[PDB]
């Protein structure tokens, strides 16, 4: 006789993300050839790695201008992709849609002053633990990098994620009040005739960045 | 002559916003930045912040999501804005400019070689409910 | 107010006044406090910028130095116009400046 199969009472429905390819309608439609177009990026961390964008800061621009003090602090924003100052960035609209990241953000520091003026700065990433650093010489400790200004003006640096769980989420949920990932800092350890020299700061994805469990958000 | 004029609103009720400006006159706003300090009634300063001769600018930390200050680069004015007055926010508002390029933030009321020159003549802003 | 200065200190004309303001290991020490001064009825000007020098228009009888954590502005004579208050402002690690109270000067 015919070949009998048991429908189940369960998972007949329409999951919405599930590999179901939908059966075919009007075929053999040979579409125009789309071959060998230029600008094509397969996926996402690959644009946003290479391509880097600009942050926000105070007065929304995105340069910190250096401050006439010898020693000084300049920018320091939490790390998490949810932080006002990373708010205009692709890396930070893009993680949006993502609940959780595991990679190492890198970030671009270029000089805009004249070739009169230098200047020497230093970032130094701060853990979770304890209070954010207040000075160069209390922020000296934990991870940091110094350059001075020059014929290159680009210094990148990567800010290293350590965390205790393997991946780490991308929306600071409002339970908490100091942000799990720790402050990164921007500090006027000295600086030459350059007075209110503008330093635009870029962000970008590292050698490794992952993003997994892609989610929705009303954006 | 360099002086500044400051213009703004005067008695309005607690829990407004308030428009300050600081009318910028004899030298342009790109080659000296301004600073905002208050006078409470009475002898006090508490700095509000101040925004460079560049768009970056600082504000006060425990005055701080409550401040915003833009800068029309043409008119020569530059505007503070306050979120939500209480019956304490009254006090003598100046507006100050630094002698160098960038002094945006709090740093330039205590440095080793910038100054504030100009002062403003002071607004007294009353708030009362 | 943030600091400690000595209320308000009087002299006569001719005499050396010296107003100490003294602060804390985080706000001076680290950079030097600046001095101003306010007219009964005008605005605030700076008398002493960098804790030890003088802006130019200000009269050379104006002289600040800076100690430890406390800080000094010497009126090396006095006169009619050197009446008002003093207020002595520095930045504290806080990233927010400490103002002290205001050192009214008296002339007998």
């Known amino acids: 006789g015919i070949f009998p199969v048991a429908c189940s009472d369960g998972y007949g429905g329409l999951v919405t993300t599930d590999p179901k390819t939908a059966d075919p309608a009007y075929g053999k439609v040979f579409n125009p050839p789309r071959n060998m177009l230029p600008g094509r990026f397969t996926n996402f961390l690959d644009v946003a790695e290479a391509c880097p964008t600009f942050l926000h800061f105070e007065g929304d621009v995105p340069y910190v201008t250096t401050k006439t003090d010898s020693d000084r602090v300049l920018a320091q924003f939490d790390l998490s992709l949810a932080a006002k100052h990373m708010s205009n960035t692709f890396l930070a609209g893009l993680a949006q849609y993502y609940t959780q990241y595991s990679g190492t953000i890198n970030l671009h520091f270029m000089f805009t002053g004249p070739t009169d003026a230098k200047a020497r700065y230093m970032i130094a990433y701060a853990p979770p633990g304890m209070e954010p650093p207040k000075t160069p010489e209390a922020a000296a400790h934990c991870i940091h990098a110094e350059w001075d200004t020059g014929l290159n003006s680009k210094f990148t640096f990567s800010i290293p994620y350590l965390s205790a769980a393997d991946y780490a989420y991308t929306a600071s949920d409002a339970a908490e009040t100091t942000n799990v990932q720790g402050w990164v800092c921007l500090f006027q350890i000295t600086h030459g005739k350059a007075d209110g020299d503008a330093l635009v700061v870029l962000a970008s994805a590292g050698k490794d960045f992952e993003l997994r469990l892609p989610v929705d958000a009303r954006t | 002559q360099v002086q500044l004029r400051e213009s703004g609103p005067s008695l309005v009720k607690p829990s407004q916003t308030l428009f300050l400006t600081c009318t910028v006159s004899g030298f342009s706003l790109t080659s000296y930045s301004v600073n905002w300090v208050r006078q409470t009634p009475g002898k006090m300063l508490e700095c509000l912040g101040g925004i460079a001769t560049s768009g970056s600018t600082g504000y006060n930390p425990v005055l701080k999501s409550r401040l915003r200050i833009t800068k029309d680069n043409s008119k020569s004015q530059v505007s503070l804005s306050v979120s939500n007055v209480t019956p304490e926010d009254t006090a003598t508002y100046y507006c100050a400019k630094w002698s160098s390029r960038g002094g945006y933030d709090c740093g330039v009321h205590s440095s080793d070689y910038s100054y504030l020159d100009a002062w403003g003549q002071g607004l007294l802003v009353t708030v009362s409910s | 107010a943030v600091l400690t200065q000595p209320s308000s200190v009087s002299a006569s004309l001719g005499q050396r006044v010296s107003i100490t303001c003294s602060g804390s290991?985080?706000?001076?020490?680290?950079?030097?406090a600046t001095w101003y001064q306010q007219v009964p009825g005008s605005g605030l000007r700076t008398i002493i910028y960098?804790?030890?020098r003088r802006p130019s228009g200000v009269p050379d009888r104006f002289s600040g130095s800076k100690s430890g954590n406390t800080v000094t502005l010497t009126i090396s004579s006095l006169q009619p116009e050197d009446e008002a208050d003093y207020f002595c402002a520095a930045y504290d690690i806080s990233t927010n400046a400490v103002f002290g109270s205001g050192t009214t000067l008296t002339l007998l």
């Open positions: 290991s985080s706000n001076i020490g680290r950079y030097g």
């Open positions: 960098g804790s030890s």
